Each structure stands twice: as C-alpha cells, then as structure tokens.
Write a protein that binds this ligand. Structure first.
Ligand SMILES: *CCC(=O)Nc1ccccc1Nc1nc(Nc2ccc(N3CCN(C)CC3)cc2)ncc1C(=O)Nc1c(C)cccc1Cl
Length: 266
C-alpha cells in the first residue's frame, strides 16, 4: 500500500549479515539505486510483526534515522531502506577505522545520534533499544539510528544498556532512552567495549540499584563523564533531554572543552 514495490525490481547482491530482526543484504533497486534489504526468515516468531518496524519507519522520517525506501508484503517479506556503507557502529568502533577515531569524531557521532533521538523525542516516541549495535554508519562518518521494531508512542531490555526502572518495572520512557544514550557514550569513548566490564547481568542490576556508575573512561574528559552521569540519574525526570544533549555535544569543543588536546586514544 503506497510503499509496496514489485519483487522483481530488487536484486539481492551481497549479504551483509544477520541484522536486527532479520537477514540483511546489499542490493540494487531498479538497477540504479543501491539499497539495503532485510528479509524475514519464515516462522521465526514473526508473521507480519516483522513488518511492524516498517510500520513505525513510515511515520518517523528524519535525516539521522535510517530511511525506509520500500516494502514487499508477500512472503518472503522484504524491507528496503537506504544503504549505510560502513555498517554497524559497534563493528566500526571495534574495526580498523576505530584506531584513528579521536574525541572530536566520536563526539560528533554522538551529536548526530542525539539529533536523531531528539527527533524521536519531539515525535513522542520511545526507542527502547538504543545502543551502538543498533546505529549504522555511512559515508563521511554519518551516524543514523536504526532498529525501530520496539518503537512505540506514549534482545529484550539488555540490563547493561536499559534504565533500571525500565528493566524492573517496564517503565520505558524517553528518559530511559537517555539512560541508554549515556551507555552508548561509554561505547564511543572505549572503542566499543562492553559496558560494566567483568559483570554479569544480575550483578549490573544489583550494583546500579545500589548507585554504582561506570567510572570515567581513560583519556575521557571529566566534562563528558559528567554528561554520562546525568544520563544515569536514578530519577528519570532529572535526566537531560535529547535537545540538550544534542546542543551540548555540538558545541562541546568550544563551550565545554576549548583547551582539548589529542591524546593516545582519545
Ligand atoms: C539493527 C540494524 C542492523 O541490522 N544493522 C546491521 C547489522 C549487520 C548487517 C546489516 C545491518 N543492517 C544494515 N546494514 C547496512 N549496511 C552495512 C552492513 C554491514 C556492513 N559490513 C561492513 C563490515 N563488515 C563486518 C561486514 C558488514 C556494511 C554495511 N545497511 C542497512 C542496514 C539495515 O539494517 N537496513 C535496514 C533494513 C534493510 C531494514 C530495516 C531497517 C534497517 Cl536499518
């Protein structure tokens, strides 16, 4: 309906891997436009709930969110979006290009993510699965938010990324996305290391409820660590908005750290 395209117009060329809720390919639409195609494996806990992500992606349109191109609603179900040339941000940070990424690039990538989540904030949506694994990198270090299957109006809650009030009581708000953003900032500043090193899930929930927070990563400024701790307030109402986070991260090297100097890793 309005978005559906003939199956013959697509050509699945190179397989990219098993992405979020489905198998992702690098294809070509109408022999002219390079695209990305997610396929549903039949029977795997999804009839048209696989199409629930494309249902949300039709309403949410923003330059920092992966844009929906088309959809094939007859099995096998295809979801066609734009192609992000660099892949997952987590793989990008762990990968070859991650070595040379310094704080200026990593803060800008975060500002792009805060800008995308600021649009989600204005649209009264909640992401519920914000992390480096669900953010795609394109050309010129363009970062875009992905995985809108759990997105709703106002991989189930990994404890290390989810706000404790959302993991425990199901209170998923935009402030629980700000908590996840603070965790993502540790992924950026640590070249994509898993948060809370050496701790299992139930140990993270007990420690975080006792007030434990991850310390300042090495070579990370205290000002950026303070922004993480604000994203990790126990009370969600006192956690910053994404409009503030975006404006903060864009002006970071003028208004916050004008005497920044590059180090070994950051
Ligand atoms: C949750 C987002 C997701 O699934 N990300 C992901 C992870 C692994 C493979 C594919 C995708 N999705 C995806 N990728 C790309 N582009 C892309 C993927 C992988 C690479 N590689 C380079 C590094 N090396 C390790 C091999 C892998 C390069 C580029 N573009 C789009 C998407 C994507 O998920 N698009 C999308 C579709 C098709 C449907 C619905 C939503 C989205 Cl975001």
């Amino acid at each position: 309906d309005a978005w559906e395209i003939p199956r013959e117009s697509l050509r699945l060329e190179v397989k990219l891997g098993q992405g979020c809720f489905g198998e992702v390919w690098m294809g070509t639409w109408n022999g002219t436009t390079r695209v990305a195609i997610k396929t549903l494996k039949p029977g795997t806990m999804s009839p048209e709930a696989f199409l629930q992500e494309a249902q949300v992606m039709k309403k949410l349109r923003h330059e920092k969110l992966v844009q929906l191109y088309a959809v094939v609603s007859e099995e096998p179900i295809y979801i066609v979006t734009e192609y992000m040339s660099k892949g997952s941000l987590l793989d990008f940070l762990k990968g070859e290009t991650g070595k040379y990424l310094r704080l200026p690039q990593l803060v800008d990538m975060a500002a792009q993510i805060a800008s995308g989540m600021a649009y989600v904030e204005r649209m009264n949506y909640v992401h519920r699965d914000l992390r480096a694994a669900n953010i795609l990198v394109g050309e010129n270090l363009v970062c875009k938010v992905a995985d809108f299957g759990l997105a709703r109006l106002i991989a189930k809650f990994p404890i290390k990324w989810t706000a404790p009030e959302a993991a425990l009581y199901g209170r998923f708000t935009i402030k629980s996305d700000v908590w996840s953003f603070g965790i993502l900032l540790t992924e950026l500043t640590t070249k994509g290391r898993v948060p809370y090193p050496g701790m299992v899930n139930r140990e993270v929930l007990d420690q975080v409820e006792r007030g434990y927070r991850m310390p300042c990563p090495p070579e990370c400024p205290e000002s950026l660590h303070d922004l993480m701790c604000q994203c990790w307030r126990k009370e969600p109402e006192e956690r910053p908005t994404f409009e503030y986070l975006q404006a903060f991260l864009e002006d970071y090297f003028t208004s916050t750290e004008p005497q920044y100097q590059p180090g070994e890793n950051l």
